[PDB]
């Protein structure tokens, strides 16, 4: 693919961790990624379904300090099930090539490959493109990492409403501690 496509980045917006919800950081549901072999997984399909106590913030924390770790994030697709994800949005649109980083109090887009130097991003994942449009993104972290880096993905279902239930906002925080 052309470099115009792979470096497609959107700097014309900013967000916070809570976004448009009124959920403070004290009230987040924080939990760790699932450790399956050397693959760390944030699966949002169950976590973001409309609940009566919605919107919640579901924050999946990926802490990396081992080499060659695969990170996989699943964001449930609009219309994958009826009603449950009808208004879901994901940010950045060009994840995993584009990630959010914390500039001051705001999250803004940055190229992940510019952020971590030996980064491995496959263009496809099980023959579907590596993009939340197909519901799964994946990347592999380098053999060594000099400087600690933190970045974010958003999978936000809080605009989805099903009767008395509202979907949840999902956050992935990836924290790469220095290793190697």
């Amino acid at each position, epitope marked *: 693919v052309g470099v115009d496509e792979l470096d497609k980045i*959107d*700097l*014309s*917006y*900013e*967000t*916070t961790e*809570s*976004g*448009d*919800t*009124a959920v403070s950081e004290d009230s987040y549901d924080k939990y760790a990624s699932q450790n399956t072999n050397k693959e760390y997984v944030c699966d949002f399909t169950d976590q973001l379904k409309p609940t009566e106590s919605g919107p919640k913030v579901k924050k999946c924390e990926v802490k990396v300090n081992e080499p060659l770790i695969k990170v996989k994030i699943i964001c449930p697709l609009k219309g994958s099930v009826e009603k449950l994800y009808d208004n879901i*949005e994901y*940010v*950045p*649109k060009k994840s995993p090539y584009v990630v959010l980083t914390k500039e001051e109090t705001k999250l803004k887009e940055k190229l992940l490959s510019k952020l971590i130097y030996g980064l491995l991003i496959s263009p496809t994942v099980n023959e579907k493109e590596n993009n939340f449009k197909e519901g799964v993104i994946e990347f592999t972290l380098p053999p060594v990492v000099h400087k600690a880096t933190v970045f974010y993905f958003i999978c936000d279902n809080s*605009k989805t409403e099903d009767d008395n239930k509202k979907g949840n906002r999902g956050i992935v925080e990836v924290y790469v501690e220095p290793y190697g």
Partner: antibody
Amino acid sequence: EVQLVESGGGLVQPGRSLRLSCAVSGFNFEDYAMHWVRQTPGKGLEWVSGISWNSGTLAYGDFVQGRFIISRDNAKNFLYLQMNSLRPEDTALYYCANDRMRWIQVPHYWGQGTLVTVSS
Amino acid sequence: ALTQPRSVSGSPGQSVTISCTGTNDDVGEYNYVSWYQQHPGKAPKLMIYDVTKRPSGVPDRFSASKSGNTASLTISGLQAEDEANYYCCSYAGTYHMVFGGGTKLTVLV
């Protein structure tokens, strides 16, 4: 009942800066997303910027390119747009508008506009 | 960036349809299409929200729909007061909005 009054337009040379203000009344401002939209008096409507109720999200039209800053004061019920490095093609009438929602989705009520001319 | 015809016209009682074509990242992606009326010298007025819905007070001769990347506004039995410019508008993703270029509606005899 609802009204929105924009202020702060005028003439600037290219490269200079203006700050637009929008005072609102008749609705509970702090619960609503807000928009800036421009209209060149010979042309159509063009979305400039928007901000959610709690400033949790904000965005800009693609011509803005880092030059403008939208912000809001939910206590004084004011919407602001700082416009830096203005270009002659930024010459337009500038409206503020509230949203139907607390997030950016659909402009609802609009102000009268303030005219911004950029020229040497 | 949404594409509208420059002008439509009709006599009172006639029907007009104004199309609004975007892309699969705005009109085709969301059900957040809105339509605005603007009289000469006045501010815009919201006529349609969420593709098909009318705010309270908009006469129901205004209706609208969407198919794929194209939204449409229909005025059935237009009146003299409907002579105006009409603008479609859509959510464009990532907290952006985008407007159509506008259509002038002329009411004839």
